[PDB]
Amino acid sequence: IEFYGPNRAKWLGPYSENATPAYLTGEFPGDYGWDTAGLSADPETFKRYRELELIHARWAMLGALGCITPELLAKSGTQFGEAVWFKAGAQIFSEGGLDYLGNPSLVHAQNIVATLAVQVILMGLVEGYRVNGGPAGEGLDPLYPGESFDPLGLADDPDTFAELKVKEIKNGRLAMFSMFGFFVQAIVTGKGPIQNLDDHLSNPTVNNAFAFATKFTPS
Amino acid sequence: IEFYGPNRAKWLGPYSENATPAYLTGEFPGDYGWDTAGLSADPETFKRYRELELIHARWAMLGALGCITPELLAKSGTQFGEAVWFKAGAQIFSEGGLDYLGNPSLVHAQNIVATLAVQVILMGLVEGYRVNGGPAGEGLDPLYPGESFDPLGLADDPDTFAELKVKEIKNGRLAMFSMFGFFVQAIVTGKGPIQNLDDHLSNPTVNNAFAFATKFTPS
Amino acid sequence: RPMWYPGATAPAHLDGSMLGDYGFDPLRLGVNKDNLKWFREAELTNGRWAMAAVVGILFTDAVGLPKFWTAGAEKYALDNQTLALIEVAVFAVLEGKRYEIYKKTGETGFLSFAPFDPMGMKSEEMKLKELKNGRLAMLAFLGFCSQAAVYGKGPIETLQLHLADPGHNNIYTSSVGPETAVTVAVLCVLPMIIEATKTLN
Ligand code: CHL
Ligand code: CHL
Ligand code: CLA
Ligand code: CLA
Ligand code: CLA
Ligand SMILES: CC1=C[C@H](O)CC(C)(C)[C@H]1/C=C/C(C)=C/C=C/C(C)=C/C=C/C=C(C)/C=C/C=C(C)/C=C/C1=C(C)C[C@H](O)CC1(C)C
Numbered sequence: 001i002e003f004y005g006p007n008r009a010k011w012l013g014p015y016s017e018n019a020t021p022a023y024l025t026g027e028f029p030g031d032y033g034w035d036t037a038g039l040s041a042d043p044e045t046f047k048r049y050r051e052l053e054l055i056h057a058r059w060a061m062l063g064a065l066g067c068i069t070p071e072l073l074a075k076s077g078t079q080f081g082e083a084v085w086f087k088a089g090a091q092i093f094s095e096g097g098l099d100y101l102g103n104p105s106l107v108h109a110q111n112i113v114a115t116l117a118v119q120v121i122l123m124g125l126v127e128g129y130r131v132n133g134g135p136a137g138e139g140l141d142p143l144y145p146g147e148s149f150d151p152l153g154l155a156d157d158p159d160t161f162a163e164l165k166v167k168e169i170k171n172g173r174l175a176m177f178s179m180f181g182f183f184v185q186a187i188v189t190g191k192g193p194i195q196n197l198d199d200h201l202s203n204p205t206v207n208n209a210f211a212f213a214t215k216f217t218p219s
Numbered sequence: 220i221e222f223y224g225p226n227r228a229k230w231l232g233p234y235s236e237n238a239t240p241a242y243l244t245g246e247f248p249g250d251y252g253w254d255t256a257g258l259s260a261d262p263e264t265f266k267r268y269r270e271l272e273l274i275h276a277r278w279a280m281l282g283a284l285g286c287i288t289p290e291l292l293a294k295s296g297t298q299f300g301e302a303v304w305f306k307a308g309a310q311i312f313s314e315g316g317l318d319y320l321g322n323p324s325l326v327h328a329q330n331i332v333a334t335l336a337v338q339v340i341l342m343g344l345v346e347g348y349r350v351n352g353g354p355a356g357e358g359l360d361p362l363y364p365g366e367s368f369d370p371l372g373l374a375d376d377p378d379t380f381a382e383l384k385v386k387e388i389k390n391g392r393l394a395m396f397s398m399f400g401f402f403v404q405a406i407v408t409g410k411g412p413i414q415n416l417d418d419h420l421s422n423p424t425v426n427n428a429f430a431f432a433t434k435f436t437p438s
Numbered sequence: 439r440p441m442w443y444p445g446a447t448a449p450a451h452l453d454g455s456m457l458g459d460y461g462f463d464p465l466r467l468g469v470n471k472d473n474l475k476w477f478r479e480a481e482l483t484n485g486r487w488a489m490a491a492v493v494g495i496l497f498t499d500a501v502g503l504p505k506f507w508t509a510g511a512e513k514y515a516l517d518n519q520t521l522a523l524i525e526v527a528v529f530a531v532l533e534g535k536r537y538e539i540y541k542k543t544g545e546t547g548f549l550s551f552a553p554f555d556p557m558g559m560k561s562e563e564m565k566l567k568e569l570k571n572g573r574l575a576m577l578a579f580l581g582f583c584s585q586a587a588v589y590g591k592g593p594i595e596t597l598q599l600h601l602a603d604p605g606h607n608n609i610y611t612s613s614v615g616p617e618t619a620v621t622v623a624v625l626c627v628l629p630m631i632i633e634a635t636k637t638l639n
């Protein structure tokens with residue numbers, strides 16, 4: 001319970017090998033000391049990896065919640081068409097464009113190239129202004145700004161803020177691994193991941209994974 | 220209109236972020252300052268990238284004109300067999316070898332391994348003599364020699380020559396991107412790129428790209 | 439300091455220090471300096487939502503869409519039960535900062551991060567201009583709720599029913615009409631009594 005220090009929860013815990021690599025000893029969230037290949041020995045490259053892992057973690061957490069929500073919402077009390085995240089990307093082609101919430105009173109996007117061009121413009125703008133700063137105060141911190149992106153004001157107390165950092169990083173790692181699981185389920189069985197959830201909860205051991213183990217057999 | 224200077228046409232124009240990376244400030248053609256990842260920070264590696272990009276650009280421009288010409292010539296008034304660049308490589312196997320121009324009075328290459336061995340010999344010779352120099356004067360410049368490869372003498376006036384450098388680099392970038400387009404059209408639809416041109420000019424919006432968007436669907 | 443009836447007094451705590459201070463407080467509500475601190479933003483926010491409601495109430499009755507007193511009655515929207523629970527969480531979150539930013543700074547702003555001015559626009563003597571617009575708008579909203587009342591037509595439809603027409607169909611020739619005449623006659627003679635309170639001191 002001492003991540004910021006030598007007594008962090010190390011990568012093997014009780015098999016910790018307390019001779020840890022000396023280029024990271026606490027002082028940054030998520031430092032769990034698991035460097036078996038050591039591709040981040042250089043400090044500036046290590047900083048790049050911290051920034052890159054933060055970006056990946058936030059994007060993957062957003063994607064993971066985007067993979068949990070719509071299927072459950074269309075399963076409970078709404079209808080989307082194909083709420084499963086496969087053909088949600090092809091809902092613009094089918095009959096009447098991409099109607100949001102499955103309702104012909106919302107977005108109703110007909111042409112995907114317009115979404116395409118506007119998406120490129122907006123994403124270039126926000127990513128450029130993410131790197132070099134810009135609106136809502138010029139960006140002085142590349143990792144965590146501290147400017148008007150926290151309109152609630154939770155970043156006053158430092159140790160709770162650091163705990164929030166560590167929670168953010170751990171959540172991001174879990175999100176990345178889970179989205180990898182989503183992608184592998186997309187490849188192998190190619191069905192709904194929450195359909196997978198319901199089917200495994202209905203079938204705990206009879207259809208586990210290895211009925212779907214003789215599919216990609218070469219011959 | 221000031222590529223050789225601080226007032227070059229930067230990668231975003233009036234979204235230029237005039238705080239450009241300091242390891243390139245004009246003085247070389249094609250310097251558009253678009254370094255988002257920064258894989259060419261080292262100067263000798265940057266020189267390698269200039270040389271490599273020049274080689275890629277000239278090779279890709281040669282390939283792009285080689286992808287535009289023969290189909291048009293066989294569509295206008297000549298016949299080649301398969302003028303589309305897919306089976307032009309297999310025209311030596313079909314019935315009577317690779318007859319140039321679609322004429323049994325020209326190259327008529329029967330055995331492809333002879334082309335293979337002579338091509339390796341010639342290409343090793345020309346690439347080795349490209350690196351280290353040799354015939355027609357020893358190579359003193361790896362980027363642009365200035366020796367007897369310009370038999371017309373257009374490299375007298377310096378600023379027009381630099382403009383020619385910039386045109387060459389821009390044409391090469393366009394050629395590389397366009398040849399990437401050719402390869403992707405070879406993958407997805409697998410038909411003639413100029414057949415694609417004619418079909419899209421006949422069908423501007425009914426068969427655009429996304430009829431060919433449900434082909435590589437996993438299941 | 440132009441008072442609410444031409445030659446008037448000033449109640450002994452409505453001097454000219456407030457913004458829209460036309461010296462009107464006959465029932466002595468804000469006698470504190472602690473509720474003035476609060477009734478000011480009650481005034482500004484109650485008015486501010488109404489200023490944002492008048493635009494919608496006019497456009498929905500200019501363009502088409504079914505009349506506002508039956509707007510949510512029929513609804514092609516989604517899941518009447520739970521979108522109100524959506525309308526609870528974001529709001530309570532937002533209220534935390536509205537009341538918090540009310541507490542920590544002096545009586546002016548509200549948004550989550552700062553006194554909200556992304557522009558360099560007027561933060562000047564013209565806050566009386568928008569509270570003036572607001573106290574106009576609140577009176578404008580009650581009229582529309584009294585048009586969903588007695589006549590049952592919308593704003594612009596009764597605007598056509600009278601406002602190209604003479605004074606033959608107005609308040610006093612309508613259902614709730616004999617009471618308004620009495621209230622007009624009573625309110626008009628009222629400053630004539632308030633002057634008699636303070637003539638005899
Ligand atoms: C449109 C212009 C645009 C520009 C100029 C940038 C620019 C940048 N982005 Mg951004 N982005 C842009 C659009 C978008 N980005 C993102 C999402 C991200 C993320 C998630 C991240 C960035 C990052 C970065 C930075 C460097 C990334 C890089 O080297 O790419 C090179 C990469 C590729 C060309 C593709 C790599 C694919 C990857 C290997 C996936 C492999 C998949 C897995 C193996 C599993 C696959 C399936 C499963 C089932 C096995 C750079 C500043 C990174 C960063 O800021 O790090 C500090 C970062 O982490 N961007 C999205 C969402 C789709 C965009 C949509 O338009
Ligand atoms: C036969 C002996 C031979 C020798 C010794 C050389 C030697 C050399 N060549 Mg040369 N070449 C030779 C034959 C040929 N070359 C070329 C074409 C080129 C080019 C275009 C370039 C060189 C370059 C170079 C130099 C370093 C390239 C390297 O590291 O390769 C390592 C690379 C590979 C083993 C293959 C890389 C493939 C690449 C990743 C393609 C990826 C494709 C795309 C992702 C898209 C694909 C499909 C689309 C639809 C998506 C090196 C001096 C480069 C240079 O001089 O830079 C300064 C350079 O730019 N050569 C051709 C034409 C086919 C040859 C035919 O015989
Ligand atoms: C691309 C995503 C990515 C990146 C850049 C990083 C980056 C980092 N991680 Mg990390 N991590 C990730 C995803 C990622 N992580 C995921 C998904 C998990 C959960 C499984 C973890 C779990 C983890 C732990 C437990 C620890 C780190 C640590 C580190 C740091 C040092 C290691 C290093 O140099 O990594 C460089 C990484 C790369 C160059 C990425 C290469 C990716 C290629 C495609 C190979 C991946 C193939 C993969 C092994 C096959 C199975 C995939 C499946 C497991 C998902 C560095 C900041 C250590 C640290 O000190 O934290 C700060 C540490 O103790 N990570
Ligand atoms: C392999 C081909 C290649 C190579 C080596 C370069 C090399 C260079 N380019 Mg360049 N460029 C290319 C192709 C290439 N270019 C193409 C096709 C385009 C048009 C899209 C451009 C457009 C471009 C601009 C606008 C600018 C540069 C710049 C630069 C310089 C600094 C960037 C750098 O370090 O690149 C290193 C590059 C590599 C290590 C190549 C990695 C390739 C792998 C496979 C990843 C590619 C995946 C790709 C993103 C996926 C989509 C492909 C599709 C877009 C074709 C450097 C000399 C900057 C400069 O200052 O010019 C001198 C600059 O401003 N380039
Ligand atoms: C309901 C919102 C509201 C609120 C909270 C306030 C608050 C305030 N106004 Mg105010 N005002 C409003 C609406 C409001 N106003 C409207 C709509 C008008 C135009 C008609 C005015 C016109 C006005 C003037 C001209 C003056 C004020 C002043 C004041 C301040 C001191 C007087 C006081 O103690 O009031 C406290 C009042 C309340 C707490 C409101 C209680 C609500 C009662 C209990 C119910 C009212 C219902 C009503 C009688 C029935 C509907 C009426 C309809 C039929 C016409 C105080 C900050 C004075 C001031 O200092 O200048 C700014 C002043 O001179 N106001
Ligand atoms: C550390 C280390 C160390 C040692 O030494 C070595 C090694 C081992 C190599 C290393 C490792 C590495 C790794 C593992 C990595 C991984 C990563 C990942 C997983 C990522 C993800 C990542 C992921 C991500 C970002 C994601 C993202 C996502 C997204 C956006 C999504 C989107 C979406 C949505 C919303 C929904 C819809 O409907 C669709 C989609 C489209 C789907």
Ligand SMILES: CC1=C[C@H](O)CC(C)(C)[C@H]1/C=C/C(C)=C/C=C/C(C)=C/C=C/C=C(C)/C=C/C=C(C)/C=C/C1=C(C)C[C@H](O)CC1(C)C
Pocket residue numbers: 253254255256257258275276278279281282283285286303304305307308395396398399
């Ligand atoms: C810059 C940067 C920056 C940031 O930072 C990062 C990143 C983004 C990564 C980067 C990018 C990169 C890139 C994009 C690259 C690309 C390239 C290319 C496209 C190449 C091509 C390239 C291409 C090329 C050479 C080509 C060549 C070609 C050829 C020879 C051809 C041949 C031929 C012909 C004649 C005809 C016949 O019948 C057949 C064939 C066989 C077909």
